[PDB]
Structures are given as C-alpha cells and as structure tokens.
Design a binder for this molecule. Structure first.
Ligand SMILES: *[C@H](O)[C@H](C[C@@H]1CCNC1=O)NC(=O)[C@@H]1[C@H]2CCC[C@H]2CN1C(=O)OCc1ccccc1
Ligand SMILES: *[C@H](O)[C@H](C[C@@H]1CCNC1=O)NC(=O)[C@@H]1[C@H]2CCC[C@H]2CN1C(=O)OCc1ccccc1
Lengths: 304, 304
C-alpha cells in the first residue's frame, strides 16, 4: 500500500565519495578503482569561471596541486587528464570499496538517485528524472558539484550523472561520467537556457496506473481516445507525443489493471482539460511525471 | 538552489538488516551488536493474525525455530524474548557493522528516513513524518515489516520506527525499537481507526520559509495576524494550534528571511482561505507539512 518517490539505497555509492581540492576550490569526486572523477571547474578561481580556458588553466596544474581526501586520509595523485568536462585523477591506491559498476548515458524521461554530497561527505539521497530538456529538479548548494546520480541493478551501480551547475530557472545541469553534458549546457558562469520543460507523458500514465493499483480511481472516465487525438491535446499542454513504443512499455501495467492504455489516455486528457477540481491523486494536486513505468513495477512488486 | 524531500544516506543501516523466518512467515530484522530486533507477528500463521495470543504462540517456539540470515550466512539464535510488540533474538555473533546508535521514541511532527526492505534486502529509502495521529504515509507491501525508520546525527544512528502494519486509509503504523506502538494501534488483523489527520502547522510554515529562501514569494501578502486569530482559522482547517514554542523554533528562519513568523502566518491563513489559484510553491499544488524547521535549515545549509 502507498506510493512514494523512493531513492536507491546509497551505501555502495557512499563508499566511493572523496573530497578534491585545488587552491581554494573544494568539491566531491567519485573514487572507482585507482581513478577519481570530478568536475574540471575544480581548477577555476572565481575570476576564471566567467570565460575559462580549461586547457590553459589545467596546463599550470601538476599532480601534487590536487588534494584528494578519502575521509581521514590523503590519496597520492600519480596522474591527471581532462575528458570533456571531467578530470580523471589517477591515484596510487585502488578504492577497496569499489562496487561492481558501469557508466551509462541515460535517456530523457529515465530516473536515477542523487547522493547530494559536500566536502566528500553524503548529505542526503533523492530521486530525479532526466527531463526532456536535459535538466533535473534537484537540491544543490555551493560545494555540491561532483555529487553523482546512479541506478542499481541488483549488485551493479550504473552511474549516469555528475552535478556541475544551476540554471536561472532554479533547475540543475550536469554530465555523464565521460564528462559530456546532458543538453546544450557549458561549464561557465553565463545565463543558460534550457528550453520548454516538456512533461514526460509515459511517466504520467505510469503514475495514473500506480494510482489505480493503490485504489485511487475517481479520475477514470467512460471515454477512450486514439494516439493522434490524445497527441493533439498533449501538444497544447507541452506533453511529449505518445508513440506505440510507449503503449508497449505500459502494456504490463495495462494488463495488471485491466485498463486499456488509450482509456487511461482519455482519463489524462480530461484531467489536462478540466484540472483536478481540488482533488488529489496519490496525495498530489498535480500530474507527476518523475516515475517511469519500471519505477512503478519495481515499487508495486517490492524489487530489492 | 531547489528544495527536495531528502532521505539520510542509508549505508550504516543497510549493514544492520537481516532476514528472520518462523515457519512460512519471513520478514526483516535489525541486527545490532548480538541482538536481532523484529516484529513479534513473525510467529503468527495467517489464522493467528485475527486474534493472536502472542504469549501462548511464543511459548511453542524455541531458539532453533527462528532462522536469521545475514545475506548468505545463518546466525545461531541462543536466546529469544518478547518486549511489547517486538522480538529480541540473541545471536552468538556481534554484527561487525554495528554503527554507533540510539533508540528514540520520536515526537509527532518529527521526520525520519525509512529504509524499505524485503527478505532482509534494501528496496529503497524515503523521508516520513510521524503524523499528529501517529500514522506515516509510506510505501509498504507484504514482507516489509521490520523495515526501520531512523535519523543520523553525524555518525550516530537514531532508530525511531519499525514497520508493523497498514490501516484501511492506506497509511502505516509501527512501533519504536522498544516495541511500543505509536498511537492507539495493535498488531492484529482488525479495522483500526487513526482519527483526524491534523496538519503539522509549524512544518507548513518551515516549508513556506524554504520557499522564500528559494525565491518563491508570490504568496507573501501585506497582512499580519495574532496567534489567537491564526488558530481560529487553523482549527477550521484541522491544523495543529501554533504555540510560542513553535514561534521560537521558527525564529532562526524568520531572522534569515526578515519575514516575522506572524506575517508568514497571515500568508498561510490567506492560502487556507483562498487556495493556490492554480499556482505552485516549490513545485507543489498543496501545502506540504512533512519538513521540520530543522529539515529546512539542514537542507538550505548543506549539513553532512
Ligand atoms: C558546483 O558546486 C556548483 C553548483 C551550483 C552552486 C549553487 N547551486 C548549484 O547547483 N556549480 C557552479 O557554481 C557553477 C560553476 C562551474 C561552472 C561555472 C560556475 C558557476 N556555476 C553555476 O552554477 O552557474 C550558475 C548561474 C546561474 C545563472 C546565471 C549565471 C550563472
Ligand atoms: C508486515 O509485513 C505487513 C505490512 C503491511 C502488508 C501490506 N502493507 C503493509 O504495510 N503487516 C501486516 O500484514 C499486518 C499483520 C501483523 C499484524 C496483523 C497482520 C495484518 N496486518 C495489517 O497490516 O492489517 C491490514 C488491515 C487493513 C484493514 C483491515 C484489516 C487489516
């Protein structure tokens, strides 16, 4: 019973967080095997961050200029290199707590857990969606950069996100662990536009199925629709167009509940056109789009 | 920037979760030093759970009848005892991963992290408030009982909650780690009433301060009020009465923002009387009461 925004257990990832310091700048690094990964802007003074030439800034830096601290202890840096927007610091000690892991570039609409860190210490854990405009709605202060996003598949950690910055809308942008930004963002202090924040339609539908599984069914109506008809209404509300692959992804939830995907679409259409009329679904007064179909199945079946 | 419902990092607690089996019934236990704590209803068959005589049921049980599994390995049970609604199984091995810990009976309106577990394995982590009616709004299926709620204060884990059951409203009830239920609940299969779900007024105010700190200030109005005047409007909306101790608790947030507590109260009063008019605060369309003032300070100051 009940449906909550739920992070993965963070223990495997807590054991990989270190502190990386250059000059005055301290942020978080991810220690996997004998490599520490961190945002390249660790090398920047406050002057530099307006229009930094990272190649020129890095050339002034040697191995000994990077202080890497794993709790109590100082790691010895024996090599450094820049890959896109991340620094790879080679250290003389393999992290003995290195979990089984992969680096994955996650797709828009997929979710992951953020372990928010400061000075290489965990602050807290929460779920985020990689939004269609390649932003996330996180909670990040100064010193949070290098905090990572991950998924767990049994014992394997899939790292998909490293935190680099805030946009003027109060949303967040970062890189995969190869240092390639999600979306059109760059690591300098300029006003940067994410575009239209489109709603993840397949996730809203997944969450309406979550609501029906959990006994909230007041919004189920007597109508059906077509993909082309629904999409006309999606377009108006800045919803992602629903496609046959999305209908296929929702098939197991459609089956478990006996509500056809296009019947749920008709329900969604009436909610978009009529609002909630002061009513709530799973204790929310708006349509939630940060649960994937997998998140709904995982949570409603107790996957561990 | 940004404000999220954020759990503590779960690593210290992941290391204390075990599986406890009696007959057909498997649930979660908490392994601290040489003791495993679990819900006493582990001893019940499905027949028993209607009107169980736990004293009589337990008398038929010996040490060897309790299977305790720490991942791969079987723990040897060398003693068992019932304390209120929890079983204490003495095992021949101290948990080598036992963190510094305390057991605390938490107050209504205070928050904690739930590590949702099945078969002694972590599923996920989320924040809950102990509600004024001593329920929580969690996500729990069959097999989740023995899952625990905790706070962390630097390196010390404060265990405050163990999960025992679901109420007909879809909310959850459990015990402290001494096995005393929060609220009027009993561990048997009967329809049980939590009463009126009163809103945690001091937490709503904390979250309105969170909103102002994060730049959401549209709801700030030109009026002030008095405690007695506000409370007249609180009463009508099933809000907890605001007291001088609550005003004192909000003092640091009032100071940091320069908004007097009674001015924020006047804002809240207009939101209760007028609703949101289709607007949102920190990405919510209703008033959130599951952040304590401490949760707001912790999150807005990067405590680790
Ligand atoms: C890294 O710890 C930091 C994370 C930020 C701090 C405040 N919330 C958050 O998420 N990242 C930055 O401070 C980056 C830094 C690296 C690349 C360039 C600098 C500036 N910056 C940033 O976040 O820019 C914010 C901004 C917003 C509007 C207009 C200009 C700049
Ligand atoms: C423990 O794993 C289980 C947790 C429940 C299962 C479904 N969601 C959830 O939180 N607890 C129970 O199943 C308990 C069990 C122990 C004490 C008595 C039995 C029955 N039960 C329970 O949760 O009662 C639910 C209920 C609801 C309405 C009317 C009658 C009974």
């Amino acid at each position: 019973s009940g449906f909550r925004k739920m992070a993965f257990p963070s223990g495997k990832v807590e054991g990989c967080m270190v502190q990386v310091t250059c000059g005055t700048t301290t942020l978080n690094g991810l220690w996997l095997d004998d490599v520490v990964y961190c945002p390249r802007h660790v090398i920047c003074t406050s002057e530099d961050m307006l229009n930094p030439n990272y190649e020129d800034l890095l050339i002034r830096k040697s191995n000994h200029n990077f202080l890497v601290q794993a709790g109590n202890v100082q790691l010895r840096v024996i090599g450094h290199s820049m890959q896109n927007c991340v620094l790879k610091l080679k250290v003389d000690t393999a992290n003995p707590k290195t979990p089984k892991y992969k680096f994955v570039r996650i797709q828009p609409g997929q979710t992951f857990s953020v372990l928010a860190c400061y000075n290489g210490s965990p602050s807290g854990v929460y779920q985020c969606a990689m939004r269609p405009n390649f932003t996330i709605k996180g909670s990040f202060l100064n010193g949070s950069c290098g905090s990572v996003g991950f998924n767990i598949d049994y014992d394997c950690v899939s790292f998909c996100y490293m935190h680099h910055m805030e946009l003027p809308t109060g949303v967040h942008a970062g890189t995969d662990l190869e240092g390639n930004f999600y979306g059109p963002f760059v690591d300098r202090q300029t006003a940067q536009a994410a575009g239209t924040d489109t709603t993840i339609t397949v996730n809203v539908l997944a969450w309406l199925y979550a609501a029906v599984i959990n006994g909230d069914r007041w919004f189920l109506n007597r109508f059906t629709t077509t993909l082309n008809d629904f999409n006309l209404v999606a377009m108006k509300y800045n919803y992602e167009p629903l496609t046959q692959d999305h209908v296929d992804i929702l098939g197991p939830l459609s089956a478990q509940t006996g509500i056809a995907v296009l019947d749920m679409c008709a329900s969604l259409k009436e909610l978009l056109q009529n609002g909630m009329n002061g009513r709530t679904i799973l204790g929310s007064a708006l349509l939630e789009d940060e649960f994937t179909p997998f998140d709904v199945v995982r949570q409603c079946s107790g996957v561990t």
